[PDB]
Symmetry: D2
Subunit: 257 residues, 4 copies
């Protein structure tokens, strides 16, 4: 394993939105590094497929698929309860699931705004709380919570269909800093970090533009983009840092963008 | 009327959360300046009370009380419908209603997080959308949307009970900038501004510390609600070609 | 007088870069409101002409021209010494003098970088310091220091020729906040404020003969800030043209 | 070499402020990874000793000490001239030299403010420009400029003795972002990054608190601060990223700080 990842061997990571994109790349990378990974999403079949690939590849870690709709609070609580009932717990929580719906501020549907909040902010916060509560009861003083933010959490770009999304990522910027603060107040060494990528070639733009597949291809064919593996490598760097270092944010963009 | 406020005479402002605090002060100030103000909240009796006082004092504007629970979208849609069919439409929207519940990130209730989002962000966005649509249908090119933000929309203070609240105000910071961009894309001269106060002596802290009113009293024993209303007047009074983006304000020496 | 300006009557405001543009508008507005204003710049002819215009209009205040090159610290200290001697001290400091030079990060001149720092940051900090020390020695507890910043002090626009200038305005954003902090630490009610306008019409453009702010718009924001009751501290006013 | 550092082998990095602290650690790390490093500062004897340590360790890279007072532009120009004539040019520029003097906004000496500007902002900008021009003349399209920023370049802490220093670091935040935009406009793949640490255990606090060395020791004893090697490891991560990735900022603090 990568230098600095030894101490995480066999410890359990949760990766939300592991059925594709960034989350699948992060899950793959943690399993390559010898972690037990619970990966969750709606499209559980993709996670099972990834786990089978990890097993065929001979990786030291294990990917454990779990079906969970993050828009459903009980689904999340049930997942954490299932982990607890099994005498286990999450030591690393990667809050990766997220989405944009093309609901502008001047004419957007309230349902799309709610959907963005439900996953990007509320589910991220419920997972953060439940992961922390499990660490606490297990006397884990050195776990790590990593939120997948965005450059859109730091500046608002003049694309109307992502304005509300950008506002949810601004919330993630503030939540990650507030989290760091509460973990200090609780007198722990549990770490909190954001990773803030620019455009990454995943299914994200295809879901945003679900009524205009061509507009989604052009986000990606026309621009140099990051790859989900690049974000996964940033997560590996953050986890591999020794315990007294707390990476607050890594802002990353495609070169020349 | 204050210089710059003449052009707003008899035009309609919606002020959300007008039943106390900053909202009540903004409503009273706009009525003093000759506007028609629809003031909404759940506690409609207070807003009615502010109307008899406004009226007793012989002010030039009018306060129209309206009962609306902003946590219910259908209630908000009904309100805009009544404004459009009874008062023509809305030219100024002051998104003032907001709250903090003491739900920390490490142990807070999801219900509290949802409640803060529902009023501070969702209702603010629904009202923005409907006010804009009202202006669009009446070919109003010079309306104004003013979001009541907070210094907590620009920095995260180490007070665990207001972390989630702060995150909703960061969302307000981003939405107000997004709004400006959309209004420019729409080729309008409609203006979008936030006002970002530090501590204001209202009922806000008493509600946040509902289980510890002594802590709420310590907060204040600050800016006054009238102070924020004066910032709203300055913003509206500015020439049409000026778009104030934000006014950050704190008590002196705080 | 505008409501809230009464308490500033006959008190002294220093307005740096008063010979045109924002500074001249700010000086005129404060004179109209009955302040004693010291307006400085490298050459005083325009400030003399403004003072004569104010006197002809019957304004209640007075404008006092002072020649000062803000790139020379000794010139600045001499200006404060003169103000202390002849007019008691400074109660309001408007740090308005500023400049942008088109010295890019990849190819710019060091002389241009230094000039921008010298005026935008160092002179502003020297004036801030001397103004505070003036208030302190007179037990003035309610003075006001106002820095004229820029929207470039809050975001970096992809225009190469203003990047270094933008970095100096980010510095001013940080200094204004640090100043607030120090004034609170000193147990005073002296106020500190930034005004951050975007595209303002330049004197250049004006002389040559909405998509722009006018100098008067910035002066009106200064009047709003000063007019706030003493317990209110405006930290920043960000403003841009509606049509920008 | 570390995965990703191979493409930098035998290429030349300039590390300013290499006579101690973070810059000495960065210079050592780059020499370990096989680069040619020009390390400069006023206290050139320290850099000679570091070069001797690196040679003694049998590291693949080489450290070239160079005496340069960064407050003197002619000194910097002569250094770049020497690098050009003797070592072709600069492909990586680490703008590390920096200082804080305890000159508060209300009563500070102007000389302290000018000293902070001269090194933290002016020297950093001069070295950036000359490093870019060095790349340009050699048709280098993949260099890297890394500025050592600070968390104080992102928030103003209520410590009066560091207010002006914080303002110099806000300038670095803005300069790094403007540098990215110019390198993009120049149609290059030259990368621009800053690293923004919280408290790092170096001589920095001792120099800031030159009249109260007890205050400097209290800083480093109250908690397990960042070490210079931790910042060097962040620099190695940034350099090791494939060329299409452009890290914009890494914000890092001591855990629990
Ligand atoms: N791609 C980019 O340009 C970009 C840039 C910056 C940041 N980000 C952030 O990166 C993170 C990952 O997105 P991505 O780019 O990998 O997009 P993606 O390919 O669309 O993947 C999103 C993942 O989130 C999961 N998800 C969405 N809604 C869910 C729900 N209700 N319940 C459970 N899982 C749900 C999806 O799985 P199921 O549909 O199977 O549930 C999928 O696994 C997001 O937070 C996004 O904001 C992306
Ligand atoms: N006070 C401060 O320290 C402070 C500082 C910075 C910013 N702010 C912001 O200022 C704004 C106003 O707050 P305030 O200080 O005036 O607090 P406040 O005294 O508690 O008043 C809040 C108002 O919002 C209304 N409101 C809350 N939930 C509502 C709902 N579901 N439907 C309709 N109305 C609702 C309330 O009326 P009903 O209960 O009758 O519905 C009340 O009139 C908020 O956005 C707040 O975040 C306050
Ligand atoms: N114009 C804009 O688009 C804009 C936008 C945002 C912020 N701002 C800021 O607003 C402030 C005023 O700018 P402006 O538009 O009014 O520009 P301006 O017309 O160029 O005014 C600059 C003023 O500063 C004075 N000045 C410059 N260097 C000086 C020095 N060495 N010593 C003494 N005085 C000096 C000039 O007078 P002398 O040359 O006679 O000495 C002049 O009175 C500056 O801080 C600027 O950065 C301007
Ligand atoms: N230490 C921290 O808590 C901390 C936190 C955040 C960021 N930083 C940043 O990290 C960077 C490195 O600082 P450090 O902590 O390593 O401090 P340090 O131990 O004091 O080292 C500073 C280095 O800068 C060099 N330098 C100073 N003035 C110079 C000049 N005129 N010409 C040439 N070199 C000069 C010094 O060498 P000579 O004296 O031999 O010339 C020394 O090598 C700085 O930019 C600092 O702002 C430090």
């Amino acid at each position: 394993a990568r230098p600095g990842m030894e101490r995480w061997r066999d410890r359990l990571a949760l990766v939300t939105g592991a059925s594709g994109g960034i989350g699948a790349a992060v899950a793959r990378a943690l399993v390559q590094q010898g972690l037990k990974v619970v990966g969750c999403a709606r499209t559980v079949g993709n996670i099972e497929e990834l786990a089978a690939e990890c097993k065929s590849a001979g990786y030291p870690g294990t990917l454990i698929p779990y079906r969970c709709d993050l828009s459903n609070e009980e689904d999340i609580l049930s997942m954490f309860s299932a982990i607890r009932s099994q005498h286990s717990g999450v030591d690393i929580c990667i809050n990766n699931a997220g989405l944009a719906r093309p609901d502008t501020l001047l004419s957007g549907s309230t349902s799309g705004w709610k959907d963005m909040f439900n996953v990007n902010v509320l589910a991220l916060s419920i997972c953060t709380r439940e992961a922390y509560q499990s660490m606490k009861e297990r006397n884990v003083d050195d776990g790590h919570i990593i939120n997948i933010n965005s450059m859109s959490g730091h500046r608002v770009l003049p694309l109307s269909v992502t304005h509300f999304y950008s506002a949810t990522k601004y919330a993630v910027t503030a939540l990650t800093e507030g989290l760091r603060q509460e973990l200090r107040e609780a007198q722990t060494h549990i770490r909190a970090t954001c990773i803030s990528p620019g455009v990454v070639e995943t299914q994200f733009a295809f879901k945003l533009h679900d009524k205009d597949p061509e507009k989604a291809a052009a986000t990606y064919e026309q621009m140099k983009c990051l790859k989900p593996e690049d974000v996964a490598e940033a997560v590996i760097y953050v986890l591999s840092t020794p315990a007294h270092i707390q990476i607050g944010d890594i802002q990353m963009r495609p070169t020349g963008s």
